[PDB]
Design an enzyme around this catalytic site. Structure first.
Site, mmCIF file in Angstrom:
data_model
loop_
_atom_site.group_PDB
_atom_site.id
_atom_site.type_symbol
_atom_site.label_atom_id
_atom_site.label_comp_id
_atom_site.label_asym_id
_atom_site.label_seq_id
_atom_site.Cartn_x
_atom_site.Cartn_y
_atom_site.Cartn_z
ATOM 1 N N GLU A 235 2.095 -16.098 13.636
ATOM 2 C CA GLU A 235 2.929 -16.666 14.718
ATOM 3 C C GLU A 235 2.913 -18.162 14.745
ATOM 4 O OE1 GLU A 235 2.545 -14.606 18.507
ATOM 5 O OE2 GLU A 235 3.097 -12.660 17.497
ATOM 6 N N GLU A 340 2.700 -6.539 12.682
ATOM 7 C CA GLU A 340 2.020 -6.410 13.958
ATOM 8 C C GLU A 340 2.989 -5.862 14.961
ATOM 9 O OE1 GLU A 340 -0.539 -9.863 15.352
ATOM 10 O OE2 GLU A 340 0.684 -9.687 17.113
#
Ligand SMILES: *[C@@H]1O[C@H](CO)[C@@H](O[C@@H]2O[C@H](CO)[C@@H](O)[C@H](O)[C@H]2NC(C)=O)[C@H](O)[C@H]1NC(C)=O
Ligand SMILES: *[C@@H]1O[C@H](CO)[C@@H](O)[C@H](O)[C@H]1NC(C)=O
EC number: 3.2.1.45
Lengths: 497, 497
Positions: A235, A340
């Protein structure tokens, strides 16, 4: 063998209770004879991957819904399914007694379980840790002379990883992701908050940060562990938000591009770990296709990138076509992988909803979409959490397929576990998604894949309350006549010769 | 950030090619953790201040030369390093296009360069000018009404100095020196040859000469440039030699002594530039200690002298101990400063030799000798010259660290440049030389100093062809194990705390 022990905590469905002496489990896998199909079934009423078997008809009469296999329409090959071995997962797992541990690991990794063949490993600490640390916390240690794995790796993650590989039958692939670099590499000098690597790609900071990937891979190799892949950052878009609360390192797509081409790509390449794959992005769906366009249209970057990692926050919408579809169209040979996924992160939801069937359906609904849009693998987040959805050092709790209650030496497998399992148990690495067309509008979610050996698998999810009669036509063999119960998931398996 | 583009011209080493869009340069400085050292290497084979790092360990594995730092043995503090902005130098720099000009100045002055902090500015014309002139050529102008700056100052030297100051890493000090006075002040009415000021100290000739220093200083202050020092005259002993072909002004040391005392000292002190330092001698090292004795044993003169400027002619031999050592011993509170060095006069050698390694060695050797004999700064001669070694209105005799090739809009950085840089870039003003003990007789030249902030720097020159194994001990940190390759120069840097 052992059936689910059901228990209800007031949600729409039940959990299966496991402990030191008992856990639900499968018999060793069997293939049905030609002319017959296997069906595995999970219902909100409490069936949990039940095995039945029925005949394939030569002929079919009717006006009911027909799903037609198109074995010539060949689409993506599948890498696999699995979850993340976070500090939190490891810590809850190892808090159980040793036989309960074995059964928890069997559930995920064994053929008596659901056959995971992917484990994602955080490089150091993330929010699902009880403390912040990197592998190189000594200030300005540019040469990485004091790089080392702490106990979180050596007494928790790595022992558990070895135990999972030992238990599994499929070769397992490991995937790594860092949340933050050491702070002395970062503009803001903290693990969280807004900042990125100091200076610019090609420089001492960026070179050090790439060397750190290699030191990481070196360390794990000294414990006899090899990685299939690493992401370039977890991220990256987070390290750009001011006040971001937990571990992070921000890169603009331009920064990621330049990082990959100047430092990370070359450094990985000139090392003994050159076979490790690099995946980019490791971020939410809506960053696509913009981030891919930025990174992949530069050939110095592109040549290093094997694929694109995406996150799927299940409580949020993203149009699959404008994101994955378009990315695939622009970059047909760069695999899309889901690295994820989680639920229960929205501001107003409970982290954990023990027994939630809704959340099971959210997983399977979203995995089918993945496969309908070119995704090649799917990785869950935490393999296990506590009944709070933790531990988490900023109290960022979420749900998990397995919930561990330490005071009771007990764990609970949730609908999510089985919704994942309907995929992971029956779509080995190598399987290829193929076409499947419906004969009329309908409420089902379905996907079809073909195994490496030629045989078929279809997953069918019904998110309606209504029972749906349906028939699956495979012209090689005939017709499967069946019913999809309201709020049910079925996997179907059959031989084609 | 960008590496040297090598070009050979048939001498023992290469030059670095810089043009309008490319020049080799450095990243911002980055200080490694205690226990780690940085090393910059340049070699005759082609390495150019390349950065590497390693450990200061606690065990001693080497068995050769040991150099032990003695940080509590303190010597002189450093004023700085730099070179001369002659007419010649400015003509060459301005010959390039502006982007190339910026690369040239950044090379010298910038953090991405070698961080010069000294610029010598000739007062009017010397031999590196394209015509003869003074600031006051209208005859018999004793009140200096027609004093003024020609285009050379207003359009070449001054704007470049502004530009250097804007680029510089550090506060820069300007030093001015005069070559000749208006010929109407001179015994010979000629810009060159044997001739001194008319009359004697106190008279109108000497007062007018003194006031010319203040008019020079005034004129440059209108352009917002202040001076740190001025020399009493450039090479005063030259003007005593018959037939001296370059601009000059003869003074016997007795005449310099009285000029300072009666005229130049009092005039500067009664003026708005009373803070400008005055340096004596500004001539070759074999004039010492004798010149110091004459000027500084007279108190009426000594109170105005802040230092002694020396020239280094690198082609000629001169024992440091009998000159510099003995000078310091007789006047230990009077700073020594090298105000001019040059090489390349050998009748049999090319004035400019592109890529000559021996000539760099000559520069570094002499700088190290300098520091070991109390010298607090070192100023090179012409910042830049053309490839014939001009323009010079008499004759081309010497090399320069940078050579400009106008017709190709390119410039070449000579080994000389890197040899100075090994010092200038890593020894800021305020640095202080400290003990460094050789364990045994050796072939290296080494000097050690301590940064204002307490960290260490050591320079090590290997003028032999053989590689020398070397340990450097810092009592508060450990041992640095290294090798000094034949024909190399290293600079080492570390934290001590
Ligand atoms: C772990 O759970 C198992 C399965 O529920 C428990 O065994 C059952 O316990 C009840 C009460 O003793 C019996 O009536 C069932 O017949 C048991 N079933 C089986 C197959 O053994 C067991 O007690 C639990 N272990 C612990 C330590 O609580
Ligand atoms: C780094 O590691 C060495 C050797 O393992 C050790 O002696 C030293 O104390 C460490 N330094 C720091 C600052 O932790």
């Amino acid at each position: 063998a052992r059936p689910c022990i059901p228990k209800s905590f007031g949600y729409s469905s039940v959990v299966c209770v496991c402990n030191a002496t008992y856990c639900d489990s499968f018999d060793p896998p069997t293939f049905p004879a030609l002319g017959t199909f296997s069906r595995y079934e999970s219902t909100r009423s409490g069936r949990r991957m039940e095995l039945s078997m029925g005949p394939i008809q030569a002929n079919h009469t009717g006006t009911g819904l027909l799903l037609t296999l198109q074995p010539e329409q060949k689409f993506q090959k599948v890498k696999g399914f699995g979850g993340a071995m976070t500090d939190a997962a490891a810590l809850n797992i190892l808090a159980l007694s040793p036989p309960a541990q074995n059964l928890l690991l069997k559930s995920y990794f064994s053929e008596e379980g659901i056959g995971y063949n992917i484990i994602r490993v955080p490089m150091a600490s993330c929010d699902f840790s009880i403390r912040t640390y990197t592998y190189a916390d000594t200030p300005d240690d540019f040469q990485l002379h004091n790089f080392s794995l702490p106990e979180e790796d050596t007494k928790l993650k790595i022992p558990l990883i070895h135990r999972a590989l030992q238990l599994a039958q499929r070769p397992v692939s490991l995937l790594a992701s860092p949340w933050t670099s050491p702070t002395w590499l970062k503009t803001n000098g903290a693990v969280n908050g807004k900042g990125s690597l100091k200076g610019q790609p090609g420089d001492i900071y960026h070179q050090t940060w790439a060397r750190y990937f290699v030191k990481f891979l070196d360390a794990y190799a000294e414990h006899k562990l090899q990685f299939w892949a690493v992401t370039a950052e977890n991220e990256p878009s987070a390290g750009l938000l001011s006040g971001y609360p937990f571990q992070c390192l921000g890169f603009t797509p331009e920064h990621q591009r330049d990082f990959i081409a100047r430092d990370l790509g070359p450094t990985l390449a000139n090392s003994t770990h050159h076979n490790v794959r690099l995946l980019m992005l490791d971020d939410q769906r809506l960053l696509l296709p913009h981030w891919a366009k930025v990174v992949l249209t530069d050939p110095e970057a592109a040549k290093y990138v094997h694929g694109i990692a995406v996150h799927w926050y299940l409580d949020f919408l993203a149009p699959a076509k404008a994101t994955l579809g378009e990315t695939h169209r622009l970059f047909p040979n760069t695999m899309l992988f889901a690295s994820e996924a989680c639920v229960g992160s929205k501001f107003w939801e409970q982290s954990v909803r023990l027994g939630s069937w809704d959340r099971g359906m959210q997983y399977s609904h979203s995995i089918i979409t993945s496969l309908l849009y070119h995704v090649v693998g799917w990785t869950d987040w935490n393999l296990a959490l506590n009944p709070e959805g933790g531990p988490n050092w900023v109290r960022n709790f979420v749900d998990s397929p397995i919930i561990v209650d330490i005071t009771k030496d007990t764990f609970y497998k949730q609908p999510m576990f089985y919704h994942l399992g309907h995929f992971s148990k029956f779509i080995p690495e190598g399987s290829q998604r193929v076409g499947l067309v419906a004969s009329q509008k309908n409420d089902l979610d379905a996907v079809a894949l073909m195994h490496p050996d030629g045989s078929a698998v279809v997953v069918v999810l019904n998110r309606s309350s209504k029972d749906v009669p349906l028939t699956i036509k495979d012209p090689a063999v005939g017709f499967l006549e069946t019913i999809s119960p309201g709020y049910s998931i079925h996997t179907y398996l059959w031989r084609r010769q």
